Amino acid sequence: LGTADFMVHHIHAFTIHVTALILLKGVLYARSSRLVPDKANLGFRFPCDGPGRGGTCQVSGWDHVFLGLFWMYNSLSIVIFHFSWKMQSDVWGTVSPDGSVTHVTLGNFAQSAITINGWLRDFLWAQAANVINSYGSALSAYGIMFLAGHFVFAFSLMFLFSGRGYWQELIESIVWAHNKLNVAPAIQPRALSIIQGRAVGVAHYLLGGIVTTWAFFLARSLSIG
Amino acid sequence: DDFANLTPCSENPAYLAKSKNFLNTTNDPNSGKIRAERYASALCGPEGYPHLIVDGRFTHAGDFLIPSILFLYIAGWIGWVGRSYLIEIRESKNPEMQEVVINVPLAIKKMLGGFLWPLAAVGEYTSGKLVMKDSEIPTSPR
Amino acid sequence: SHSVKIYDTCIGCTQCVRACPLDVLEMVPWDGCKAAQIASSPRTEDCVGCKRCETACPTDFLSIRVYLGAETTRSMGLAY
Amino acid sequence: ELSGQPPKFGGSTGGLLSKANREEKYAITWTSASEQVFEMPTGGAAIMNEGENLLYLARKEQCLALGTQLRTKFKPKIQDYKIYRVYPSGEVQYLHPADGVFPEKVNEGREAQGTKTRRIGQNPEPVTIKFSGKAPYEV
Amino acid sequence: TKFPKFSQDLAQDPTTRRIWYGIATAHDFETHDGMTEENLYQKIFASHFGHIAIIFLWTSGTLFHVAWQGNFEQWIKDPLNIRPIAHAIWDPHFGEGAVNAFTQAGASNPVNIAYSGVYHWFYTIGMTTNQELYSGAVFLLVLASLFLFAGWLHLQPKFRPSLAWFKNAESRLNHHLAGLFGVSSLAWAGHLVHVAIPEARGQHVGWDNFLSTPPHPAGLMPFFTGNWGVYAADPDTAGHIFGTSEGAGTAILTFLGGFHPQTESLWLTDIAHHHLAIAVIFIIAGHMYRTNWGIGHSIKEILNAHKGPLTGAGHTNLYDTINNSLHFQLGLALASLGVITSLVAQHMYSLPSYAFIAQDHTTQAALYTHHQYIAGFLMVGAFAHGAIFFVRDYDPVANKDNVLARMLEHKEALISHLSWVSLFLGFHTLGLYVHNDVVVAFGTPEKQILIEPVFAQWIQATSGKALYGFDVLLSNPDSIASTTGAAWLPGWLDAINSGTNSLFLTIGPGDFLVHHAIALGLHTTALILIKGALDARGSKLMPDKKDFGYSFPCDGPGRGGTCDISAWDAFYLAMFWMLNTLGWLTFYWHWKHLGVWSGNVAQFNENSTYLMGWFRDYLWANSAQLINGYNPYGVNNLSVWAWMFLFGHLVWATGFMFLISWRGYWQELIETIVWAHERTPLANLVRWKDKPVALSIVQARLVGLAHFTVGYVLTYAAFLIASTAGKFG
Amino acid sequence: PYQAIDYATQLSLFTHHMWIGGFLIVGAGAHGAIFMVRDYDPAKNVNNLLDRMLRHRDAIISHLNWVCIFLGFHS
Numbered sequence A: 001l002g003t004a005d006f007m008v009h010h011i012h013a014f015t016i017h018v019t020a021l022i023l024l025k026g027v028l029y030a031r032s033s034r035l036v037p038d039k040a041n042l043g044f045r046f047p048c049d050g051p052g053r054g055g056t057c058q059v060s061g062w063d064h065v066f067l068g069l070f071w072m073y074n075s076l077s078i079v080i081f082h083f084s085w086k087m088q089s090d091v092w093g094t095v096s097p098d099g100s101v102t103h104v105t106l107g108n109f110a111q112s113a114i115t116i117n118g119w120l121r122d123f124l125w126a127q128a129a130n131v132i133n134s135y136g137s138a139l140s141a142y143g144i145m146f147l148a149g150h151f152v153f154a155f156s157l158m159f160l161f162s163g164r165g166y167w168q169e170l171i172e173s174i175v176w177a178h179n180k181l182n183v184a185p186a187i188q189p190r191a192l193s194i195i196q197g198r199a200v201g202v203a204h205y206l207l208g209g210i211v212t213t214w215a216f217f218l219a220r221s222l223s224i225g
Numbered sequence B: 001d002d003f004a005n006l007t008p009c010s011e012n013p014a015y016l017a018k019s020k021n022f023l024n025t026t027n028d029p030n031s032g033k034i035r036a037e038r039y040a041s042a043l044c045g046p047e048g049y050p051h052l053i054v055d056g057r058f059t060h061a062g063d064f065l066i067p068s069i070l071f072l073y074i075a076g077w078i079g080w081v082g083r084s085y086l087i088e089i090r091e092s093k094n095p096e097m098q099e100v101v102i103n104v105p106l107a108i109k110k111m112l113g114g115f116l117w118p119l120a121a122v123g124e125y126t127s128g129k130l131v132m133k134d135s136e137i138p139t140s141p142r
Numbered sequence C: 001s002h003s004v005k006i007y008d009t010c011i012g013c014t015q016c017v018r019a020c021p022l023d024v025l026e027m028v029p030w031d032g033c034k035a036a037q038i039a040s041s042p043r044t045e046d047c048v049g050c051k052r053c054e055t056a057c058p059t060d061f062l063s064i065r066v067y068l069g070a071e072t073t074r075s076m077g078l079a080y
Numbered sequence D: 001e002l003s004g005q006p007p008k009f010g011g012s013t014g015g016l017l018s019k020a021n022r023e024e025k026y027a028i029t030w031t032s033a034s035e036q037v038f039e040m041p042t043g044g045a046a047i048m049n050e051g052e053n054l055l056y057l058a059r060k061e062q063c064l065a066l067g068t069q070l071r072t073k074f075k076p077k078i079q080d081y082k083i084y085r086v087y088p089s090g091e092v093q094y095l096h097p098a099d100g101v102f103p104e105k106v107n108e109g110r111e112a113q114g115t116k117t118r119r120i121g122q123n124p125e126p127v128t129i130k131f132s133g134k135a136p137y138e139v
Numbered sequence E: 001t002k003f004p005k006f007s008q009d010l011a012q013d014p015t016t017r018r019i020w021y022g023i024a025t026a027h028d029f030e031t032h033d034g035m036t037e038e039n040l041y042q043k044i045f046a047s048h049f050g051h052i053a054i055i056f057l058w059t060s061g062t063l064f065h066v067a068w069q070g071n072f073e074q075w076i077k078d079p080l081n082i083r084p085i086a087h088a089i090w091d092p093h094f095g096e097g098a099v100n101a102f103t104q105a106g107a108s109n110p111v112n113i114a115y116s117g118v119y120h121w122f123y124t125i126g127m128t129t130n131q132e133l134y135s136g137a138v139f140l141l142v143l144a145s146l147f148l149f150a151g152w153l154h155l156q157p158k159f160r161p162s163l164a165w166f167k168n169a170e171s172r173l174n175h176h177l178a179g180l181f182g183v184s185s186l187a188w189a190g191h192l193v194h195v196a197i198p199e200a201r202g203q204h205v206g207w208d209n210f211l212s213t214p215p216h217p218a219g220l221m222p223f224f225t226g227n228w229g230v231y232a233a234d235p236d237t238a239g240h241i242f243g244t245s246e247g248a249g250t251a252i253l254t255f256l257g258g259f260h261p262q263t264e265s266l267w268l269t270d271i272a273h274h275h276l277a278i279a280v281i282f283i284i285a286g287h288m289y290r291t292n293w294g295i296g297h298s299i300k301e302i303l304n305a306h307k308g309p310l311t312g313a314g315h316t317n318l319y320d321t322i323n324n325s326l327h328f329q330l331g332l333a334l335a336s337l338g339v340i341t342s343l344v345a346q347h348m349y350s351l352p353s354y355a356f357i358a359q360d361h362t363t364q365a366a367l368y369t370h371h372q373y374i375a376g377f378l379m380v381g382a383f384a385h386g387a388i389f390f391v392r393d394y395d396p397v398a399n400k401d402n403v404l405a406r407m408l409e410h411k412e413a414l415i416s417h418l419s420w421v422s423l424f425l426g427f428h429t430l431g432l433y434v435h436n437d438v439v440v441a442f443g444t445p446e447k448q449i450l451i452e453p454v455f456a457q458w459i460q461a462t463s464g465k466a467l468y469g470f471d472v473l474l475s476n477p478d479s480i481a482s483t484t485g486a487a488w489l490p491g492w493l494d495a496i497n498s499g500t501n502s503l504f505l506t507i508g509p510g511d512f513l514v515h516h517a518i519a520l521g522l523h524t525t526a527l528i529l530i531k532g533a534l535d536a537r538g539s540k541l542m543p544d545k546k547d548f549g550y551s552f553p554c555d556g557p558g559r560g561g562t563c564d565i566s567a568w569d570a571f572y573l574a575m576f577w578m579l580n581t582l583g584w585l586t587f588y589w590h591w592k593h594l595g596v597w598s599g600n601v602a603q604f605n606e607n608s609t610y611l612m613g614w615f616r617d618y619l620w621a622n623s624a625q626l627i628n629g630y631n632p633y634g635v636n637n638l639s640v641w642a643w644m645f646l647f648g649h650l651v652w653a654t655g656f657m658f659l660i661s662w663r664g665y666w667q668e669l670i671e672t673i674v675w676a677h678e679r680t681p682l683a684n685l686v687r688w689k690d691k692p693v694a695l696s697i698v699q700a701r702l703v704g705l706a707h708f709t710v711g712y713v714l715t716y717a718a719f720l721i722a723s724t725a726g727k728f729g
Numbered sequence F: 001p002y003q004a005i006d007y008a009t010q011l012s013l014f015t016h017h018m019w020i021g022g023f024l025i026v027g028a029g030a031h032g033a034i035f036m037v038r039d040y041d042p043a044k045n046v047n048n049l050l051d052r053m054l055r056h057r058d059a060i061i062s063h064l065n066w067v068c069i070f071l072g073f074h075s
């Protein structure tokens, strides 16, 4: 353990305390708060108390969990990246019959993992050569999946960055179109609720990110031993 | 003399070199040979891969036109049977209920009577039931 | 402060008054509806614009509308 | 001034701040027939006395939330709660209920203010009242 | 509180929202307290004077810094090897490694390298010594001073223009068409003839001797007699060396066509006849509208006359609508400016004008990307301000039955058919891309669906490209259009039929796929903007949206929830799609041109048909030089670009806090922080003046979008510059 | 046996069970908030540990927010 390990362990501490902050604030302030004094009557899962008081979006405990999911993802991603790079750089490798050890990444962790540029070039770029070049071999299913992971992530941003009023109006126009041809459904379509929109966004986001990381790790570790 | 930069794969050295190693998609051991002999009749680029022509010429009609009609018939079938089922289920005192619980007998009855969809649609348009007047449709404020 | 207006489509259903958490609305006698009562907003200086009153209104669109304007300490719901 | 006998509470950090003694605070008074437990809108639970009780809060919404809790969350209901606004100069303004009758029910002597005589769809067009400093509802 | 003086609602706010919303609504004069039409117009006029002065100051500063700390007088002696210098570097925080790395371009101090291509522009218009650059900078300073004083003066009470002077459309159109366009272009043609061309032919002409030497040996005699063909005789030969007299002609106005053999740019005499003819056309156009002499057309009569039997009222009363509304005019201007900016990019990357600018690939890439991004921004702004017009200025009774008010009659059909076309493009384009990706992944790339872009190849053939063997129109040497003896035909056909230039680059299947993807992006962004503009007045969910203004947060959680319902939200959504479409466009352009410059066109021709090729051969492959700008082993001149790359990757991510997390959480947190500050001994002595609050919802969306856009732009700018400079520069 | 020699299995098992743990902890927070909203009753929690938690929560959140800012900044 050295300087880089020190910094990464304290980064872990930071991310964990932040996730605990979000979840603990969600639990403690669920009943009520200074902003909303009767939050308990609105239930656990409600989107907002309205644009009043300057805006009361995401005050329920459910929204606190929704926000904590991202921070859990961030913390665990940093943890698994730390594990992977440190193991590849200082532990895993091969042994010569003399007794010397040759590590997978030649011990570059102790000097590159101290900057963000190191984590970009020497880890995300260098170790992705095994997954991007997987086409045409038995590892192609990972490469595909890798790209698939990079897609769904972006897809989720349609739901996190927007609101249901725009989609309701667009559905109104499309319903007019289906009405002109006498093909409108009896079950009137509606845009997803605010809570449902947040849930869909977080679910597709987590799925995309985790699938990306899984494909990356599997394709990398099936090419070194 | 169109496509002076394109040559048939049968006379393309890149395709001739690269077609000996075509993989087998199924367990059939000759599928690579079948693929090679079928793709020898197309127009290939300098990379030895077939290219398609969709300008409307009938010599390359199999490139787009035949699959075009093949798709169109099926899509029209699906749309027409869906619309017919919805229309017939509307006046059932619970059309919303029968949209989540499918009426299988009527659904299959509409499935079968759906191959003649183009003639039915043409007849319906001439009968005025395919479209509705703009004064009979909900509209949003301007 | 926010402005709360009640139009002539109110049916005197009193839902808006009960839904209001900051006691801005009131029921006053009227004649244009069967219930012979209508909604009034005498204390709009205490309205925070939470839109619960509109959410409770059962008439087509809204017989009660809330327009958000100048923000004061009361209308922003500040405790500090 | 006002009555007293505060409810038995251990205090909390969710109570009043500087604004209370610089801008305004709020008071709620009520008479309960038993010495029981209620939920403080500022976090925690407090015991309210048998007899008259007075409680100071920082927002009118908190006072009305406590009033709702008193009215609904007790088998012997409470209907005599009063909410005043306490100014930093000691001037006390009696806020709720305004006339003593609950606003949810019709009663004589009210003025019927804030009412438009037209539908929401008959509001004047924004362009016609341009450069008047008024939105369509304001006229 | 005094600030903001122009609004009283914001001035009585005790929180920090007062400052934010005072900054936000400062330059929206139409809603200030007690604002009249006359005062609004006069303030706009003065502010426009201000922007013009700022532009002139910016140009003067560019010129001055280039002349002071540049290497122009050495760049001219070897434009093909020396790197242009933008400005010097004075960073006290620099170390020795950065100092040694950034002492580039043969300088003696840390220095930047210009990628705006101003050296080529200055060389092409005849500036050969930095004293001329200095004189231009000082003259621009004086011009900016004059414009600032003009704004100040026309703001004075007795020089304050009237309202009718601001609503004289005919006179403004006449003066600005004939004078601002025609006369200015005529003067530019005169500058090119009298100065630029003689300097290109190795003759030094300045203010000291331009009044003596005539541009042509026969001055002004043939022009008045009618012997114009004299000026087109003896043009520059193909062996002409730019800046010297070796193999140079004496003609000044020619239609040579094609490109200069050496500089690979358009002939300057072609520029002269082009701008002169354009000036003549504009001067004829400027005498169209009557002002006060009876002769001329009146716009109101034209619009009211062109009524249609199918449109009910045609273009009736549109004159009053456009003249009374400022947002209508701003939308029209923004749309036109965006269209012609995209046109500028497209017609400049393929038809370079400045000398040796085609060789310098990094500057060409930067210019294309820059002006294309600006065009996208302007196109978004056009629709945004049109929606603002619909909210504020549109009158449903004055425009009754005209074309404008008839859009709202069939707006549902517009939005529905546009959504259908967007879905139809997206489904099948993504299907084809994913099909190619999967097919290549399974090791059988011969099963890709590869459509030849037949129609665009046919267009290239019509313009005279003989590679594809269509022999149609100019490619057909027997058609009438190719046998007219047009003077430009030989040179133009010579230029188009050589692969050495970007003029009508050869296209293939990947080009087809990416053009159809760009079409998807365009139609989708247009769908968002049009839906927002047409729904600005109201919809089924909010029939009275006009009474709420243009930018309001929501209508609360009632009626099923109404987040992001204002037209401002439509703008905020469409900005993302604009950014994504521009990303696709610029990625395509950059990859194709990297292949062209390196000569390895086969790489793009092969790997642009599936998305893994884009991910690997473009993103992964070219990033190698960039991210190694600084290493554990050292640092090179690309260090700043790597730092800015990471800076963009950071700001882009930072925008997601405001884009994802919403207000109530932060308000509760701020309440806790306020409690903490109020109870801390030695910290209660210092207390705030404006009560801290969380950012408002609309402010949150705007701030998140701003961080997002800044990161998006900076990341790609750094990547593009670094990759192209390391590979070639 | 033969697990540490199989690097892919080591990495996969580590990451998999850590993701499972993270999801479980987030669910703990969620269903604790659910309890607090639904099953909590003030009458049964007079001056107990839960009440005193609910009564100095501003101190908890403020000090935790400060430690989060400090850790983020310095780290």
Ligand code: CLA
Pocket: E045, E048, E049, E052, E165, E166, E168, E169, E171, E172, E173, E175, E176, E178, E179, E180, E181, E184
């Ligand atoms: C001949 C007389 C004349 C002239 C020269 C002008 C000139 C001008 N008027 Mg104007 N005006 C006139 C008469 C005239 N006016 C009259 C009679 C009236 C009353 C009816 C007005 C009323 C009026 C108003 C109300 C306003 C103006 C404004 C302006 C300025 C617009 C700013 C601008 O973009 O210009 C620069 C534009 C160009 C140089 C040309 C546009 C460029 C086009 C798109 C082509 C691109 C060129 C080329 C392709 C690119 C070059 C590349 C190069 C850099 C390498 C401009 C200086 C505005 C202002 O505020 O100015 C202070 C304004 O608000 N005018």
Ligand code: CLA
Pocket: E023, E024, E025, E026, E027, E028, E029, E030, E330, E334, E377, E378, E380, E381, E382, E384, E385, E388, E550, E551, E568, E571, E706, E710
């Ligand atoms: C000719 C150009 C032009 C002009 C004169 C106007 C004029 C106006 N616009 Mg408009 N607009 C334009 C172009 C233009 N627009 C374009 C191109 C767009 C598309 C993006 C828009 C989008 C737009 C919207 C969405 C809105 C307006 C509004 C307005 C009105 C004033 C309010 C305002 O924006 O000021 C205030 C402006 C700001 C606070 C902008 C500050 C943001 C800064 C400039 C970004 C800086 C980022 C960062 C610091 C960069 C640092 C980099 C570093 C870290 C490396 C006014 C009528 C508003 C309105 O409705 O008025 C009624 C409104 O809501 N405009």
Ligand code: CLA
Pocket: A151, A154, A155, A156, A157, A158, A159, A161, A162, A170, E419, E420, E422, E423, E424, E425, E426, E427, E430, E520, E524, E527, E528, E573, E574, E576, E577
């Ligand atoms: C990669 C991300 C992504 C994708 C794929 C889309 C896709 C779409 N957006 Mg979109 N959007 C995004 C990001 C994205 N968006 C972001 C970040 C924003 C900013 C907030 C927006 C803002 C936005 C607006 C404002 C609008 C859209 C619209 C659209 C639709 C237009 C049709 C189209 O372009 O292609 C066609 C559609 C696709 C290619 C998507 C379908 C992809 C799947 C694979 C098809 C098959 C379904 C699949 C089999 C289901 C399996 C599920 C099962 C496994 C559980 C489409 C659904 C517009 C719309 O509604 O059009 C009508 C519209 O108005 N979006």
Ligand code: CLA
Pocket: A018, A021, A022, A067, A070, A071, E650, E653, E654, E655, E656, E657, E660, E661, E669, F065, F068, F069, F070, F071, F072, F073, F074
């Ligand atoms: C890269 C993106 C990014 C960044 C930097 C942050 C940063 C932050 N988030 Mg955030 N967040 C993000 C994305 C991001 N978030 C996303 C995508 C979401 C969606 C789920 C959230 C959701 C979220 C929640 C729900 C919460 C946070 C919280 C926090 C804060 C944690 C305290 C901290 O780290 O110390 C402070 C910040 C930093 C150390 C950032 C680095 C700043 C640099 C290193 C220092 C700059 C030096 C100096 C300023 C230079 C001056 C230059 C001069 C010109 C002025 C911090 C402000 C928590 C909070 O409120 O704080 C406790 C919290 O509760 N965020």
Ligand code: CLA
Pocket: A044, A045, A062, A065, A203, F023, F024, F025, F026, F027, F028, F030, F031, F034
């Ligand atoms: C022992 C584990 C456990 C148990 C028994 C429960 C039990 C319950 N939870 Mg809980 N929860 C858990 C773990 C658990 N949870 C965890 C780990 C989290 C953190 C994410 C949550 C977060 C959570 C929330 C936020 C909520 C509940 C709610 C509920 C209640 C029922 C409603 C519900 O979620 O069902 C219905 C569940 C679903 C419909 C989920 C199906 C959709 C999932 C997300 C898709 C998963 C896809 C999969 C991972 C991959 C597929 C890929 C695709 C391509 C096929 C019930 C008391 C709800 C409540 O308030 O009830 C009182 C509620 O709002 N829980």
Ligand SMILES: CC1=C(/C=C/C(C)=C/C=C/C(C)=C\C=C\C=C(C)\C=C\C=C(C)\C=C\C2=C[C@H](C)[C@H](O)CC2(C)C)C(C)(C)C[C@@H](O)C1
Pocket: A181, A183, B054, B055, B056, B057, B064, B065, B075, B076, B077, B078, B079, B080, B083, B121
């Ligand atoms: C009947 C039916 C329905 C309804 C259908 C309706 C109402 C349809 C209405 C259509 C309208 C109003 C308009 C349609 C316009 C169609 C156009 C403009 C077609 C253009 C075709 C072109 C340009 C052909 C182009 C080339 C043609 C040729 C094959 C070349 O090689 C390739 C290529 C692409 C160049 C549904 C939807 C209800 C259900 C369906 O199942 C059936």
Ligand SMILES: CC1=C(/C=C/C(C)=C/C=C/C(C)=C/C=C/C=C(C)/C=C/C=C(C)/C=C/C2=C(C)CCCC2(C)C)C(C)(C)CCC1
Pocket: E327, E328, E330, E331, E332, E335, E336, E339, E382, E383, E385, E386, E387, E389, E533
């Ligand atoms: C809503 C609104 C708005 C907005 C909108 C927009 C802004 C639009 C745009 C639009 C656009 C932006 C459009 C464009 C168009 C274009 C065009 C129309 C073009 C054309 C072209 C042509 C026609 C060409 C031709 C040719 C060729 C091809 C070749 C040869 C030559 C020639 C030239 C012949 C406004 C503000 C206005 C107003 C109010 C309302």
Ligand SMILES: CC1=C(C/C=C(\C)CCC[C@H](C)CCC[C@H](C)CCCC(C)C)C(=O)c2ccccc2C1=O
Pocket: A158, A159, A160, A162, A163, A164, A167, A190, A191, A192, A193, A194, A196, A197, A198
């Ligand atoms: C796109 C979008 C919509 C529109 C999306 C809608 C209406 C959902 C449409 C879903 C379709 C009908 C089905 C797709 C999902 C199914 C689970 C797929 C099942 C596949 C099997 C049958 C194989 C919202 O309603 C919304 C609401 C709040 C915030 C953001 C958004 C948002 O971004």
Ligand code: SF4
Pocket: C006, C009, C010, C011, C012, C013, C014, C015, C016, C017, C038, C039, C056, C057, C058, C059, C063, C064
């Ligand atoms: S809820 Fe609506 S209808 Fe009922 S009393 Fe109030 S304003 Fe009238």
Ligand code: SF4
Pocket: A047, A048, A049, A050, A051, A055, A056, A057, A058, A163, A194, E553, E554, E555, E556, E557, E561, E562, E563, E564, E662, E697
């Ligand atoms: S934007 Fe949505 S979540 Fe926020 S206050 Fe409005 S309705 Fe509620």
